[PDB]
Design a binder for this molecule. Sequence first.
Ligand code: L91
Ligand code: L91
Lengths: 248, 247
Amino acid sequence: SFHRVDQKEITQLSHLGQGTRTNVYEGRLRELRVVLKVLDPSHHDIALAFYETASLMSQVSHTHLAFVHGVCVRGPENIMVTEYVEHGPLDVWLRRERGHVPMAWKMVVAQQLASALSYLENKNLVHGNVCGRNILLARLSPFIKLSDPGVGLGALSREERVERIPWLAPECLPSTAMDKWGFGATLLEICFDGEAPLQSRSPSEKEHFYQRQHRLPEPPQLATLTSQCLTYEPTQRPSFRTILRDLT
Amino acid sequence: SFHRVDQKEITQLSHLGQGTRTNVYEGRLRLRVVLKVLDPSHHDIALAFYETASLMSQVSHTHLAFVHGVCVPENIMVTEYVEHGPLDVWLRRERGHVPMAWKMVVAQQLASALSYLENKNLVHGNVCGRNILLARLGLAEGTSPFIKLSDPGVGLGALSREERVERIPWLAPECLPSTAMDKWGFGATLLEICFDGEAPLQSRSPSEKEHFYQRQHRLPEPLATLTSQCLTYEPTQRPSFRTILRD
Ligand SMILES: CNC(=O)c1cnc(Nc2ccc(F)cn2)cc1Nc1ccccc1S(C)(=O)=O
Ligand SMILES: CNC(=O)c1cnc(Nc2ccc(F)cn2)cc1Nc1ccccc1S(C)(=O)=O
């Protein structure tokens, strides 16, 4: 249950970047500025995991969640028509403004992210792709929108799950609990100005880090919170009601 | 008058474009900045470039771009880098898809900056879409654009007749052979904005542009009352920016 968009209602503009099995563009929707996520020519299992994301995002409403307008089918291409956010991905912005991002600013983003994830938790819904790249800035206090997760995690290959380390929950390498790990790793990425740990490490090194059960570094007002979220035991991770209450 | 910047504090990068007697580059200041590199010039030209740095260093307004100072045979104005660049370039890229409400925001922000200059009895002398820079695009829902009026570059008084003729239709007709000239500049800029970065007479030759002003021909209608009032050949008949801003 998502809206079907005819290709006559959309205009594809400049390439913005790439997602997992997708090419992201700016566009218009008849007029609104939108973001088009063009899925690669794919088999039905991949397309279905992309429809599941459109469905999930069409059934939710939260101020810190980006809007999904619907889905367009253009030949072998599936297009998710989504909300355009002014300043784009958070990680890109953090690397541009490195050393000049206040801790109070980072705490606002963390609270807004926990708020969106608490809402998904209450509805027993899984995002499965929480990372700085999927955090979009509507305003630079800041105002964030968590993007759709793209092709659902369950449809991806081991190689793609290994690429998602350290954001990927370790139990997903071979539940709502995976988003606490995602949130925790995202907090480290925010503290480190868009420089996530293990980003210079090879796939074998990333996989060995998880296989040996090595823990990620400490970020100071967030060290306890991240350490609790970044536990290999999913049941031991705190709830977002706890995380959100503790951020206040 | 303005801050002096040593060549050791600035790094020159990508070539953005050209200005009147300048080459505009992206740069770094030990901050991302814009470097306005003056061509090898006579002292009258350099002095008119210093007058601009001096004028822009003595002003502070949210819709006016910042001047960091000057680096001194090379005269380099070190200025504020504005994210999306020139308005006219953007308008031509987005032709047919720019809402009227968006254009009205830009017009208000421009009149606001020019009202501030008017109150201080300061003359810009180069109001055009090219000198309007977009800090924000106002593309997302419930977001409006945010403009910064650039410095005027080499002051009008130092330029040749050929360069003043090239500035038509933005150039006030009394300048071809006062704060009043910025009302004409503003009016012509409003036409350019309404026409999606396509100013009138832009395809016309220098002889044609000069004949248009010499015969006292009036520019087309786009805001129609406001532009018609601003684009009058009698400088005293042009409305004040307090009137323009209030309207
Ligand atoms: C749900 N909508 C989005 O995901 C989305 C919304 N607004 C954007 N604004 C923007 C503004 C300026 C700019 F320079 C770049 N982007 C970017 C977006 N995605 C994006 C864009 C590029 C690369 C990766 C992604 S992603 C999250 O899809 O991986
Ligand atoms: C006072 N500061 C400026 O003038 C200035 C500030 N930011 C710019 N950002 C920008 C961003 C993206 C892009 F692709 C191009 N430019 C361009 C600028 N000038 C400029 C640049 C090229 C041509 C003409 C001028 S001009 C006004 O000097 O005539």
